[PDB]
Amino acid sequence: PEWMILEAVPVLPPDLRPMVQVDGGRFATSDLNDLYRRLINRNNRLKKLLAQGAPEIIIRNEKRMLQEAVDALLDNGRRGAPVTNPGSDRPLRSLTDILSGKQGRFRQNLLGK
Amino acid sequence: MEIKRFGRIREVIPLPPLTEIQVESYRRALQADVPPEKRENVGIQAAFRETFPIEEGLVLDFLEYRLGEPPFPQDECREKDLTYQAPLYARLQLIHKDTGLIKEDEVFLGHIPLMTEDGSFIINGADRVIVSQIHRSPGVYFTPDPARPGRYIASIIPLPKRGPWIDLEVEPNGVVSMKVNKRKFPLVLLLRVLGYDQETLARELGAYGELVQGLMDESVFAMRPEEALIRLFTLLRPGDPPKRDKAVAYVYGLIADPRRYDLGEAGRYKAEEKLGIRLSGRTLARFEDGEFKDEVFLPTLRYLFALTAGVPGHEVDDIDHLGNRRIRTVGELMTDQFRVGLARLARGVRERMLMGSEDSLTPAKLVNSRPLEAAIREFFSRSQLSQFKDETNPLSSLRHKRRISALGPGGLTRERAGFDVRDVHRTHYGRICPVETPEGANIGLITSLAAYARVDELGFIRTPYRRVVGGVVTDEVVYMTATEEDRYTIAQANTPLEGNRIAAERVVARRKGEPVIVSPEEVEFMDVSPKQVFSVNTNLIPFLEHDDANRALMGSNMQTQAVPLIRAQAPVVMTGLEERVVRDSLAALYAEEDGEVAKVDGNRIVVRYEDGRLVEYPLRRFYRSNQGTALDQRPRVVVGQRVRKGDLLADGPASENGFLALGQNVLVAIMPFDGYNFEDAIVISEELLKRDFYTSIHIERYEIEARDTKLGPERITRDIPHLSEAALRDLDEEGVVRIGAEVKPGDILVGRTSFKGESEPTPEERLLRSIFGEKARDVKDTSLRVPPGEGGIVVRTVRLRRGDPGVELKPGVREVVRVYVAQKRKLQVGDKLANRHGNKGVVAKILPVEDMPHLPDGTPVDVILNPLGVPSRMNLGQILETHLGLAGYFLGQRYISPIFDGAKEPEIKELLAQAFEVYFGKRKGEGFGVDKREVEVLRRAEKLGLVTPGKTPEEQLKELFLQGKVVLYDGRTGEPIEGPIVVGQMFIMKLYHMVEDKMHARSTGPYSLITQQPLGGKAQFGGQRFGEMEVWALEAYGAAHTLQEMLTLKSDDIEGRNAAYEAIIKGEDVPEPSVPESFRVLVKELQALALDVQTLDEKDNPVDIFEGLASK
DNA sequence: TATAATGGGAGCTGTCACGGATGCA
DNA sequence: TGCATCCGTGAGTAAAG
């Protein structure tokens, strides 16, 4: 049962969330990279706040933010507000969204192509 | 030719300016011609007044704004991919309250896009159109509660994103609730906060069925306004510390702040009219002398209780009534986005005001114009209502400018739109056309402004009527809203008049849309014209009254799709609207004053006016539209011509002497033809290609950039490796194809070289090099070639280089080259034709002329339409048109037949009689009798009851000709068609759906990044989608191997697709496939969710589909 | 690295029907 | 044992865009 709780969070291979130069020299990238970056920034700041003996309010805030980072990575939008990129109302596209729906992996690329 | 016209209805007023909705909306929102002091508190001026002043202590106040002149004219913006815009300056002053210092400056806020003369925009070089939006008008509404019958919901709706919806409801427990931000609380509390006491509420609401007792709560009156206010703040903000100033700020911003809450001026007026009260501002309450004073809440509660009890003069509201739905035109939508940009700018202003060296703070040091610039740029580039302009033909642009959408920002989500919104409401009469809407998902959500309709200052659609006093029809016209219209008995526009007096004893009229037979004494108004019920497009359909609405819709819509033809003609049967459409769409050119024409040219017309001045009109010649159709103006006057004001100088695209010319007048035979016109297909004569009927000019734009790379620069060059002179024949010195060349698929248009990616040559490459002793060049061929199935004649090249005057490209690119390729498209098998009645079909066969059915005098028909398309579709109008066309063929005249007021059968029969004389008496004079085959057809017709027995051959042929039918000879045999056939002239258009643009095929090509499946779309050399349902089709056949091919060898089995291609080029059978790569992506994306997915064998032992490449 | 500064803004809305879990009387 | 009530979820295909 405890496996429903994550200690190590897996990271998808980079080609499945590419960082590609489009024709003309600019860069296009998947949303998973910004979700993972949120996660890693908050996790690293948590490790530093622990190593530096911070009060309880602060560690509690960090841990809450870390749980929500993981939640946005896996099922963004499910609980609370959906994480968006700066200057846009569009929700970022998490792993659940990649799997499901009309445009999801199954219906879009596995049951028809 | 002669233009005979029918019709007995004189139209008092002409059609209004057809683009006035767009142009006037934007003019009102900008006020650019108004001197600043004289501006009204509307538009962007009202946005400025809302945002300013900015406080907290420093203050930044707004004096005025001004719009400068556009840096570049419209054509230059279209070329340079620039936006046609004006600089926006705002005069601001900073004041320190304590210091009294006042620093004043005019700061620059960026640019605002200007609207062109025809009501369109130019954003980044492409013409765009902002589509008006329809929505529920702000105000106070009363709707029935769908659960509890005898109960009603009071709804208080402000402007979109200008406050919260507020619902009042009488609960099952008797207390009156108030829902706001999804929070139900007893209204009594807010009534107390307003300063109301139980005495006043008791004397105001006691009359109603004891309902006022559900408003009576003792614990509420037990506290003063402050304690009730804090109670409400706690009920609305769980957890927020209930401070006093915090609660006052929240409640004020929620209910009385004109900068946060805003009914429209229309919402204001409608609340005033509904509740029978008067409003001071556009808010529900006010903050006066420290306390809150009510404006709207008590009137609304009074009306609600009165409707619940049932006292008369209270009715639930129809929310689809066009007196409760209003239009948000260009100006209002742009003003809203402007207001949002201004709010962000103000946030930044206060941010900079708090910090910073407060001794030296100018207006320039506080305003970051970027948020405002971004909001406007977003609205004009990526809004749902900012649409790529449809300029296929001029009517396309006109219709686009006059379209109304219920979708978009602040509107409805699709699939959240039931029958009600999409219905044609009774109040649509005269305001929104009932036929011009899309077929498919958007039906009833995209509509068109009726032809006589105007939108008033409040945003409601108004239609004109004539005053009728004592049975006399004045020429005083009154534009009404639907609310106003519902008060009157309005007669029909066709009611017979002698002079100005109603000459009929019984008169067909409307009362609240209901049709009623009424006496002339009861008639108060009368319709202006039948034209006022329909859109512009629908008003172009002759004999509309004989066409089922479902097909009128199609003909209406398809006129928008007509392609400008090099020999375009106006129809031989018109509705009388074909000239206004050319004029208002700014297609053609006209004379500005009376004058004599000095010069005439393929490129320019110079006119000497009565003032003695010389005015030169240049002509737009072979310009490329958004849809690639050619837009050239051709001169129609000659040197020395006398011209009065408003006389035609130049014909625009799809204009014939100032008449809207969307197609050709062809000679039609309505008969089957050996299956080649089966199921709406059409058969045409090669004589149409011979005389360049249905031929159109099309221009495509190709573009290429050379940019700086981390591996060296790209460069446009003629020096392209590994190419012969055969490949470089038509390339100029610099590498760009020469104007005039004929380019076919595969031809280079612009040479370009790119430095190769870092690569160690594979040992095979090294040995091949050694064998051939040739160094691999540093660069590679990346030239821009002609895509498959395209080409034509080069007509323009633009070249822009970094370091050249006036030129600055985006960071990185050294040079940009554009090539414009023209092509003359003849009609071909696959192209789409249609007439104005909804008859549409694809050319399926082009016969040589000697196979075409011909009249006895040797004249072959042009196209053969199949009669099986008529009865099921009930578009008999195209039949009557054909009949009239027949007469016009031999009389040599065209006709104007107003809709519902046009040519009837007897007058068409008179014309046909005259035509038959021209058609047959010619024969009798020239010395030929009736033909034997004509006798045989006459026998057949006599058995069909079409002619009377015992009349002469000529008399019977005249009888048939009066029925519109003639003898027709098969071109292949010379024997007659056993029956007489309906032959006549019909107006037929070539639509934008040409097969040249659609045919596509692919063996192998680009694949997608993650899925490794083929890209989609002709432009990407894409593969067809074999979707879920195609898979079901293959499954139901039991084509396991065909299906497995689709799923592996042809899509994303990498090894499989490679091995299949190799086997086929070698001549072997294709190998058995392997795992599709997207399933591996699924396995890894599940692993990314902490789910272990394991392919096993029958022994439950894992199988590695990754071939070890990801197991340590 | 040193005047003092000590709790936030944006909601935004014409379905719809079902299915299944929670909440009361 | 029974109802109201709330939350989550899904709502046609291909094309172009």
Ligand SMILES: Nc1ccn([C@@H]2O[C@H](COP(=O)(O)CP(=O)(O)OP(=O)(O)O)[C@@H](O)[C@H]2O)c(=O)n1
């Ligand atoms: N949104 C859309 C639009 C079109 N289609 C497809 O295109 C056809 C349109 O029928 P149609 O209306 O052309 C049948 P018509 O020829 O007019 O009359 P008839 O019965 O006498 O032959 C349908 O058969 C659909 O399969 C769709 O699936 N969804």
